[PDB]
Amino acid sequence: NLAPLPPHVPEHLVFDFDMYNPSNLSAGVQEAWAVLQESNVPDLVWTRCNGGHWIATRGQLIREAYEDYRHFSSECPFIPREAGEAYDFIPTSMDPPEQRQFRALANQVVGMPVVDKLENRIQELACSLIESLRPQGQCNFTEDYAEPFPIRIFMLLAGLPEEDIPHLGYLTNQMTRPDGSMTFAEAKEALYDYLIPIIEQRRQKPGTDAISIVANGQVNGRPITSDEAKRMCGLLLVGGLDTVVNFLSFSMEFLAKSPEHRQELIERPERIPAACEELLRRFSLVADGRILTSDYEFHGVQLKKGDQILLPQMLSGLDERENAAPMHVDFSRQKVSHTTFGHGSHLCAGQHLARREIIVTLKEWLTRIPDFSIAPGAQIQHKSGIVSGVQALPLVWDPATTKAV
Numbered sequence: 001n002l003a004p005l006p007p008h009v010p011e012h013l014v015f016d017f018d019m020y021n022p023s024n025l026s027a028g029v030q031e032a033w034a035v036l037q038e039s040n041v042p043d044l045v046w047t048r049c050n051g052g053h054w055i056a057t058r059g060q061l062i063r064e065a066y067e068d069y070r071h072f073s074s075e076c077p078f079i080p081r082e083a084g085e086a087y088d089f090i091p092t093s094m095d096p097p098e099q100r101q102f103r104a105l106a107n108q109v110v111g112m113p114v115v116d117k118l119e120n121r122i123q124e125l126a127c128s129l130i131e132s133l134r135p136q137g138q139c140n141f142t143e144d145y146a147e148p149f150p151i152r153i154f155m156l157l158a159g160l161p162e163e164d165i166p167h168l169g170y171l172t173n174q175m176t177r178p179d180g181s182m183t184f185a186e187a188k189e190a191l192y193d194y195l196i197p198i199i200e201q202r203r204q205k206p207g208t209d210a211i212s213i214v215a216n217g218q219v220n221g222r223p224i225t226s227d228e229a230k231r232m233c234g235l236l237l238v239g240g241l242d243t244v245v246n247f248l249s250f251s252m253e254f255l256a257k258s259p260e261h262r263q264e265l266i267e268r269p270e271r272i273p274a275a276c277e278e279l280l281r282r283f284s285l286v287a288d289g290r291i292l293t294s295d296y297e298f299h300g301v302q303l304k305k306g307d308q309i310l311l312p313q314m315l316s317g318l319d320e321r322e323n324a325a326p327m328h329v330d331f332s333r334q335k336v337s338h339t340t341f342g343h344g345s346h347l348c349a350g351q352h353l354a355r356r357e358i359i360v361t362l363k364e365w366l367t368r369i370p371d372f373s374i375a376p377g378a379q380i381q382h383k384s385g386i387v388s389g390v391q392a393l394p395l396v397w398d399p400a401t402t403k404a405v
């Protein structure tokens with residue numbers, strides 16, 4: 001379904017890419033997006049899909065636009081337009097300097113000191129989950145680890161019952177990879193309706209959990225409102241329940257096909273943080289964007305006020321101008337260039353938690369289950385959206401080649 005080409009967009013810039021169903025998806029989702037970086041595609045193109053919008057395809061442009069909030073506003077950060085307009089999460093839907101005081105509060109609840117505090121629980125849970133799976137000789141990695149590991153850690157940090165995971169995960173997925181069953185607004189509304197009474201309770205009787213801390217924080221000299229707290233907590237849920245989950249699956253899928261990469265990390269685990277960065281580059285998975293605040297000429301292209309521009313975080317590190325042989329996983333790259341956690345003022349608040357979860361997973365999985373593979377004749381399907389994902393990842397292994405610690 002192609003929207004009529006706006007008069008200001010010249011035809012040579014048209015490239016009808018569908019971010020929710022890219023044509024080359026069967027080759028892998030990153031590969032499907034990388035079609036935007038072939039020699040036939042300009043640096044900045046207009047797709048008529050999904051209501052019509054720009055797509056920047058090169059790291060330089062993506063970084064520049066994410067820095068220039070004056071022209072590229074986060075007030076409407078999702079495609080399609082109806083989703084972007086309904087989007088009111090905090091701090092993401094705010095530009096500097098307004099986002100600042102809310103972002104400071106986000107850092108308080110998901111930032112570094114919180115990770116270096118929950119680290120024992122993170123380590124504990126990874127070991128527990130992996131040891132439980134180890135003697136089976138198989139698992140569906142998405143449901144058996146990729147979901148419960150980061151999600152249970154998030155529910156712990158937020159003080160929310162694990163029994164609510166299925167419902168919350170469903171709603172989160174509707175916002176990033178919609179199925180058509182409900183509008184963005186309806187999904188966001190269901191999430192908000194869940195949070196509303198919980199926020200009320202925790203303003204009545206504060207705990208030390210993330211929701212309590214947000215709901216009782218302060219902005220420009222005054223208490224945060226219940227509305228503001230809801231809008232921030234909603235974003236924390238979306239951010240805690242989707243990205244790391246899917247990232248872990250892309251990474252484990254790769255490791256399942258790459259015995260030599262597994263051994264690099266097992267033999268020299270001090271390389272694990274660098275490997276984490278390289279996997280974050282190669283299997284980058286987010287693509288949101290911004291809205292034009294005014295008419296603006298950007299790299300020779302006339303953008304109009306109100307035009308949406310997708311600035312795919314995924315693409316920067318896949319750009320061969322940023323990394324040579326970008327589709328090759330090389331743990332020894334002298335610089336792993338990427339914007340996987342975003343760029344500019346909205347650079348991911350949870351990136352430290354994410355990295356810790358990834359690094360713990362790499363170490364603890366490979367220690368106990370050093371040799372595994374994708375199940376014979378299994379077809380792995382990826383899905384694409386604001387956050388791209390892995391549908392299922394059936395893994396197999398010989399339990400005789402595993403180790404308890």
Ligand code: HEM
Pocket residue numbers: 074077090091092093099103106110235236237239240243244247285286288289313340341342343345346347348349350351353354
């Ligand atoms: C591999 C894992 C992750 C990736 C790839 C990722 C990616 C991103 C990206 C690209 C953005 C910027 C979006 C924009 O500029 O519009 C962002 C923002 C954000 N993320 Fe993550 N993220 C990850 C993990 C997490 C985790 C574990 C949390 C914990 C709740 C989290 C919470 C947030 C929050 C609260 C923001 C908003 C920050 C702001 O607007 O100032 N993320 N993330």
Ligand SMILES: CC1(C)[C@@H]2CC[C@@]1(C)C(=O)C2
Pocket residue numbers: 089092176235238239243286287288386387
């Ligand atoms: C694009 C994101 C990854 C970022 C955090 C969660 C997410 C889906 C948002 O709505 C902002």
Ligand SMILES: [C-]#N
Pocket residue numbers: 238239240243348350
């Ligand atoms: C962030 N997700």
Ligand SMILES: [K+]
Pocket residue numbers: 036037038041042043044057058
């Ligand atoms: K291009």
Ligand SMILES: [K+]
Pocket residue numbers: 075076077084085086087088093
């Ligand atoms: K909006």
